[PDB]
Amino acid sequence: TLGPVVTGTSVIAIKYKHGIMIAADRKASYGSYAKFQNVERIFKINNKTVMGFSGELADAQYLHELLTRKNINNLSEKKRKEDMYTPQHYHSYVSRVFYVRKNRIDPLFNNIIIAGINSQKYDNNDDNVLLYTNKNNNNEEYKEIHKDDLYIGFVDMHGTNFCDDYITTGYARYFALTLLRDHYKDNMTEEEARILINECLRILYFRDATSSNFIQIVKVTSKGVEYEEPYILPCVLNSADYVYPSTLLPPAGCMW
Amino acid sequence: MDTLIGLRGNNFVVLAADTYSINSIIKLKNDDNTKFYDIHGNKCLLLGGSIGDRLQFGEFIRKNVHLYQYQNNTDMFVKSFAFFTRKNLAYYLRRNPFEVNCLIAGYDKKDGYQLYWCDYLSNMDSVNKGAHGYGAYLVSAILDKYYHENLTVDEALDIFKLCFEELKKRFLLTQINYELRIMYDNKVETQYVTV
Amino acid sequence: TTICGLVCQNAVILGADTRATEGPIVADKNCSKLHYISKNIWCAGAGVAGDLEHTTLWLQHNVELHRLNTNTQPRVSMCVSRLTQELFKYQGYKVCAIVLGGVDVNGPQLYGIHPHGSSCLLPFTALGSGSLNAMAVLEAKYRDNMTIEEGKNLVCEAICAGIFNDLGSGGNVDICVITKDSYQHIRPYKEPNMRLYHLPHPTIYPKGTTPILSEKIEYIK
Amino acid sequence: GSIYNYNGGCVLGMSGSNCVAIACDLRLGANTFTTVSTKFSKIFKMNNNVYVGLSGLATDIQTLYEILRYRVNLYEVRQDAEMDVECFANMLSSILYSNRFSPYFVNPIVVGFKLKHYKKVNYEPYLTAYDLIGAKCETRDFVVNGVTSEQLFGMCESLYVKDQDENGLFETISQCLLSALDRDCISGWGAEVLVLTPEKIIKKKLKARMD
Amino acid sequence: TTTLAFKFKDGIIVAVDSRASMGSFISSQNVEKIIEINKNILGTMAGGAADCLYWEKYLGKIIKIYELRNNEKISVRAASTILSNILYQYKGYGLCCGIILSGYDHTGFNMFYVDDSGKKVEGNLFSCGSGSTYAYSILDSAYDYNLNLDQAVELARNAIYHATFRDGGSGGKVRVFHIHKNGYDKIIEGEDVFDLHYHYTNPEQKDQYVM
Amino acid sequence: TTIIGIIYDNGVMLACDSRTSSGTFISNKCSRKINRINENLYVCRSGASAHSQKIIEIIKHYCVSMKNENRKKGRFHEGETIDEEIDIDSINYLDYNNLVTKNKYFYEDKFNDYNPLVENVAHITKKIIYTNNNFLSCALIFGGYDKIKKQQLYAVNLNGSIIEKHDFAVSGSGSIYIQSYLQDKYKKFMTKKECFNLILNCVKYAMHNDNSSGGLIRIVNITKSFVEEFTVVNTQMNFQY
Amino acid sequence: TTIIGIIYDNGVMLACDSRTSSGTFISNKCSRKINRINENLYVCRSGASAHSQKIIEIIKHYCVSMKNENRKKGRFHEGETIDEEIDIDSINYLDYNNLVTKNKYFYEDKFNDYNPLVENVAHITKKIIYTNNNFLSCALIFGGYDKIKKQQLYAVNLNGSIIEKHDFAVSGSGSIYIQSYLQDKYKKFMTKKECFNLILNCVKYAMHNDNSSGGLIRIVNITKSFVEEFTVVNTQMNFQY
Amino acid sequence: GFKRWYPYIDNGGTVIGLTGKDYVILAADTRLSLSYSIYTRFCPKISKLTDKCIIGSSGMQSDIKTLHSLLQKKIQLFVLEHSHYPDIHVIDRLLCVILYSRRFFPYYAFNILAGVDENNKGVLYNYDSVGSYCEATHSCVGSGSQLILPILDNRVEQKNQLIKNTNFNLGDDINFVKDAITSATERDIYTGDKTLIYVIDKMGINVNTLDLKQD
Ligand SMILES: */C(=C\S(C)(=O)=O)[C@H](Cc1c[nH]c2ccccc12)NC(=O)[C@H](CC(C)C)NC(=O)[C@H](Cc1c[nH]c2ccccc12)NC(=O)CN1CCOCC1
Ligand SMILES: */C(=C\S(C)(=O)=O)[C@H](Cc1c[nH]c2ccccc12)NC(=O)[C@H](CC(C)C)NC(=O)[C@H](Cc1c[nH]c2ccccc12)NC(=O)CN1CCOCC1
């Protein structure tokens, strides 16, 4: 891969009282051409781990296949739920991949978020793993997971990697990151987390040309990994001066 | 490359240059005479660089200074001469640069014996000893070491002999023919040295 | 740099940070980036500081000359025309991104001007390297017909976001409120950054500790 | 940058209680590593209350000094008064920007006294620093410029003390300059320090490293 | 950097400065540019410090194994050949190395200059680094094979001092070692060139010295 | 950016998106790309904002000069004396959401005595652009009404050529995506409502498919006697499939 | 070049133009860009002819291997046992003008026992393209029928990414011009006639607007039991206005 | 028609080291940045190698992490094989070999190896990403090195001061390091947020924290 051709825009992941909430719009752009409008940019690695990407779709798919086979081998060798790999383990794996490809100067044109639950003490989902049937889609309360038991990690093109209570890629790394550094707080409820993420996505939709308002939300919780029904974000302009007709401005000068 | 050397004492100024006129891989002359520009009133401009730029700039400066002295019926001061030369070189630097290094030596009653060092970028300053060319690297330390205040003309010439021997022995271009201009006792003398 | 502006009811509020940077080094910790063009017009600058200072001074004095000659109130549209024509003449080589705000017969007006000579009339805007963080704040919180106090708080929040999220922004927050009858320039407005550790006592060198070669004393008369 | 590295050089300016100080390195370089002079001063007096420290390309330093002397002399002969420090600072900014697209490779500082009349006259320390196209930083404690800017900034941030007499001001500025010069290959070979007081000027040459 | 070595009637005199730099910033003033390869061989290094140090350690390992196997001390010529062949194998990779190997073996005192380009020049007097030209001039103007130990040490010290004075890349301290039949001595462990300047060029300290 | 112009039975309708972006960042959310040169003459701008804006300022100055010189001496037209409405509120209505989205003004020069000609303004613009086509890079669509040729569309293309369009003109990056849609849906002598719907749909499709097109939609309807202007904010594209 | 694929109620229809050009010269007037990988699997090629052709040859070899390995041992389906017509002559009729323009064949593997899967072939192609995306530059549309997912469209994009399309896929330089047209006209569960008309019109508009698209139009209709192929030569676009 | 990809980035940072009679200090700022943005405000730059040795690096974060992990793996393997913990000098030679192994694609990392040896003397090694130099008193790597090193020279060596001071102790040295890092934070855009200070002495390694400007 010499460079990006078909690309996805920012991803946002945050911690809240019940786990991880990760959001991305379902759009992949072939330049300035929004060719694909229903693309999946968040993938499930196992019952406690998800991967989001921003950048080249081909490299993201390559990494997704690598992680899928890594999970299958882990499951083959598993004897107890403690044997399942953790989000930290997958983050280390992806960071090593990126570092080696940097050394070869054959990078993946991507920024990756690896998020999930770093513990096995909140459920028995990994006692019997189902890969081809999702029993989730029969409702019990969510479990309040400790912040220290959750994991969000970032990897970039040069192999730079770290973790935090919230991670952003793309233009989120400016807009959503400012909003999160201002307003994020610990143990947010699901509705509060969704409201914060929706504000960030609305600002991104208004100020980023490669984004859409068709949003995919994924929750990693004690119930496992849940994909929400994709929804259209309502995005209205915040000023009537935008809508004011141009013919009502003075006809002389550079009023535009 | 043309090696220029200059030494200023309390009672003299000595300028020295190699006497080679170079055109590609052959020496046109071993007794070149296009580097020294003697100017009435005990002034000397020693130039180093391409022969064409050397000739043009040296003659331009000499004719301008002679015009000044004829118009004003007076001798230009050495400091005025040096800074006039530097101002002209700086003026032409950003338009059509002369690629010449300058050693400006002179004597006047107001300031005594004066030596100024100027490079092709027109960076000038008065010095007690200076050098230009790739032989500067090999003669500057000799000048530093053997120079002292109250030096005499003959001791200065001995220092110059050391410099010439070093340029013959260690410099890639084995330079053996040098011309010296000596200003002292309100007279200017020419010498030719071979090592 | 983080500069920003917004239009509230009957006023225009401009804000700026106070850091000038020469590569990775802070050349000025308290530079003034808000400039008076006229009693009812101000601007905030981003880009090359020398270009910004020269251009703002030139615009201020040309506007004052025009005001003296016409004996009328200066116009934000006139400032926009002059600035854009100059910047276009130089083809973006005068790197000046300006938030120009003022109040005239047409009411409060805010313009964003870019180095190549384009302009846009906006309700709010932000420029500089912190412009994206400031814009995040402004997009989140802006609404029409805000009180002057609410607009001041919002401008402060935007500039603070820029200061604390952009490495090329820092220092204090300067604000200017421009109405049709007066301007209030608050410098500093926030002062959010200060050196946090100080030695127990300052290091005073004992007299004569520095060796000297010579000392010449001259008396000024 | 390399054009600044060609010669090197550094200037510093500090303020005290009713005094200022301006310091410079005395080296003249060539090809970034050859020392040709050890007495190339970078401080120039415009009038009794105005000094300019010019660092950068030596030819540009000399040219800018000649232009500034011309302008100041004309202004002063016309007005029959000494030029104000703020007026000189603004004039220097405008002169530097007049060559915006082919600039002088000089990074100057202005150090002096602002005179305020009430009977007696009040002398207020005045310091400004510039970039090569006239961007101006007005400061109350210290200004630096040259290839040693980072070292000087660190030393002045750590060691500057507000409201010092002339002796403490001289010690502080000289220590800052010497420590900053000790870490620069292309600056040094002697240091010149001027301490301005409303009634006298003290000029000192420091015993510095010559390597 | 300035490193020099020369043969004289009582052995070899080796001298170096102690300055390291990255660009125009002085990274250190107390590095050791003379190393002992074995008991009877000293190498003075110039250029890339990391390359010089690594390849000198490599040569030391090779010489140690050779001497252990063959129960004899290696010759300076053989060590220089090994080093030059190794360096030549890397020609075109960017190594920066100028090493003077001086030592005593069964054929007397020997001195070789080895480069990263695969050069190996046998000689009686060598100088390397950015101050090499100044050191060369000083050594050539006053060299003699019949100098006493004190005179030779003084000559080496003076040459290093002048190189540091004229070259911005050299400075710090001057070290002078003496190689003789039975090994080597450190006559000058390290001497600041500050005192050298104010003892050679400006003993009076009444004013700033004018170069 | 998407700018369109269409000629219907009784006038000419210009429409534009309102997104100005510096690459992928959106510098201006809602810019004004349809600009009035004269009461009966409008221009849609595409390409570099600085270039198009400065050109349009110069052309407005020129058109003022031309209108002043077009005035004749004396009095005229002493015995002579010179429909379906768009439901803009219904068009803009959104369930999940002092707003002004419609303006209308009548020409002061009723008989077109001194108003400059659309061809004249378009051609002076073309000459200006061609004399500096080594630097300037902008594409313009002049839509206007004059008593000689009635409603007119002129395309001033990149590099400074001029083509008069008798059906429709498109320009900008987003027009490519709607090229065949407009060709298929256009017909001669459309009614005002048909033209409004067609041009609105064209801009909506262009914004849906183009990352450089977005924001609201601005529409200007120039007729024999008046000019109407609308702003549309219900720009989302909803597909059944 | 223009390649399109559409999914209608009972199958998948691929269509393509047939112009291969080296810049502005047309090297091949009527090339074959829809190619059979298996009886129930077809690929439309776009981009460099050499790259796409060599890739398709490799993939055909791979698909032969896969089909051979898919065969199980024994006998099966002992007791088991396994239409609007396009008026192609009328479609092609031209007043001013032994020609074969229609073919149809039934699958030999009636029950899809050993035929490879559309996703399998598309993904092996994607892997091959991605392993050499530093060199290869081609875009492919796989249209096929398998008994697991029925009719399928896969887009293998430049740089080697794969997206399954459930409504339609387009590619080539000419698809941009018909983007909004196809989006507007497409609907779910179209009849064969509706899909044929839509895809033919899409290729015609793309050829009208794109200089790199021309020649005749090739259409392949893949259904559960057979494959039909049509050639259309009445490609001229006639506008009333 | 694609742009080439550069495999190096600078993530900022400053690491200071200061030795004493029987102690060593290593301070590092924790900010991680990319161009004009902050990736995170807490990325430690110092890693513990032994009970008497730590290493702090500045440069590309991925290279720093990989190099610190590789050094730790080498030291653990050394302990397992030769049944004793290497001292700071052995670790210095080991790191030199590791660094020159990549001589033609160097680690983008400048590192200070701080420790106390068998004589209970503080030791510092400065690494310029390929080679090592033993530092007598103090050292600094990263973006603030040119601001900080003059200060530490003035406060420690005092070469340009006739009236010198010699009472150096752990508390005064810690205060000097805090002042140096704060002054660097004043003028360096890549230094800020928090700083971790490790003191190694006879009682082991102790870590304290100091707050810096967040702009
Ligand atoms: C905002 C930052 S940004 C990244 O958005 O460009 C600030 C805006 C700013 C700073 N100061 C003022 C004053 C008035 C109005 C606005 C102001 N811009 C900057 O700080 C500049 C950013 C760079 C990338 C252009 N920095 C500068 O222009 C430097 C200022 C400077 C340098 N040394 C100084 C000493 C004293 C006083 C000021 C300074 N200058 C340069 O970078 C010099 N270059 C030389 C080549 O030509 C361009 C300017
Ligand atoms: C002589 C100078 S010269 C001009 O003749 O090359 C010295 C010789 C020298 C210096 N140090 C030692 C140690 C042992 C033996 C010999 C020595 N050469 C230099 O100083 C080098 C000159 C450059 C132009 C090749 N400089 C260096 O090699 C740098 C040393 C260094 C860097 N950081 C330090 C901190 C503390 C102490 C020393 C150093 N290193 C580099 O320039 C390598 N760069 C560093 C930046 O990233 C890229 C690699």
Residue numbers in the entry:
A (entry chain b): 2 to 138, 147 to 265
B (entry chain K): 1 to 195
C (entry chain I): 1 to 221
D (entry chain J): 2 to 119, 126 to 218
E (entry chain Z): 1 to 211
F (entry chain H), G (entry chain V): 1 to 82, 89 to 103, 109 to 252
H (entry chain a): 26 to 240
Text lifted from the article:
Unfolded peptide substrates must pass through the antechamber before reaching the catalytic chamber for degradation.
To answer this question, we determined a cryo-EM structure of the partially purified β6A117D mutant Pf20S (Pf20Sβ6A117D) with WLW-vs at 2.58 Å resolution. Because WLW-vs is a β2-specific inhibitor, we were surprised to observe WLW-vs in both β2 and β5 catalytic sites of the Pf20Sβ6A117D. The overall binding mode of WLW-vs in both sites is similar, following an anti-parallel β-strand configuration resembling peptide substrates. In both β2 and β5, the inhibitor is covalently linked to the catalytic Thr-1, the two indole groups at the P1 and P3 sites are inserted into the S1 and S3 pockets, respectively, and the P2 Leu and P4 morpholine face the catalytic chamber. In the wild-type β6 structure, Tyr158 points upward to interact with the small hydrophobic Ala117. Also, the aromatic ring of the Tyr158 at its new position hydrophobically interacts with one indole ring of the WLW-vs. Especially, the hydroxyphenyl ring of Tyr158 interacts with the indole ring of the P3 Trp of the WLW-vs via an offset π-π stacking with a favored vertical distance 3.4 Å, which likely explains why the β2-specific inhibitor WLW-vs also binds in the β5 pocket of the Pf20Sβ6A117D, supporting the observed enhanced inhibition against the β5 activity of the Pf20Sβ6A117D19. By comparing the structures of the Pf20S WT and Pf20S A117D, we unambiguously found that the A117D mutation not only causes a conformational change in the β5 inhibitor binding pockets, but also a substantial conformational change remotely in the β2 active subunit that enhances the binding affinity of a β2 inhibitor.
